[PDB]
């Protein structure tokens, strides 16, 4: 699954749709290799944990979309 031919110079965009405890929202985009952009998206989620609580992710769009919810 998620078949991927990797290339160091590959350019991709990972969309992170965030939903917070009070239901507020925002979308953040990360660019670079699929692996790096993916790593940066989760790193951003981690920075928001202190103020917004633990996060849960549901991957979609074959991995290009990360729907992340914060528990508060």
Angle at 39 between CA 16 and CA 34, to 5 degrees: 80
- Report which secondary-structure segment, H or E, holds 65: strand 65-70
Q: Which of 20, 34, 55, 70 binds Zn ion (CB under 5 A)?
A: 34
Please tell me whether residue 6 binds Zn ion under the rule CB under 5 A. yes
Task: Report in angstroms how near the CB of residue 44 gets to Zn ion at its nearest.
Answer: 15
Pairwise CA distance, residues 31 & 41, whole Å: 9
Task: Please work out the total of residues on this chain that contact Zn ion, with binding judged by CB under 5 A.
Answer: 7
Binding part of the chain for Zn ion, among 2-10, 21-29, 40-48, 63-71 by CB under 5 A, reads 2-10
């Amino acid at each position: 699954m998620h078949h991927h031919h990797h290339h160091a110079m590959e350019e991709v965009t990972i969309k992170a749709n965030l939903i917070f405890a009070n239901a507020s929202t925002q979308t953040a985009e990360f660019k670079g290799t699929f692996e790096k952009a993916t790593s940066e998206a989760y790193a951003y989620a981690d920075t928001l944990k202190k103020d917004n609580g633990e996060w849960t992710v549901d991957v979609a769009d074959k991995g290009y979309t990360l729907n992340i919810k914060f528990a508060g």
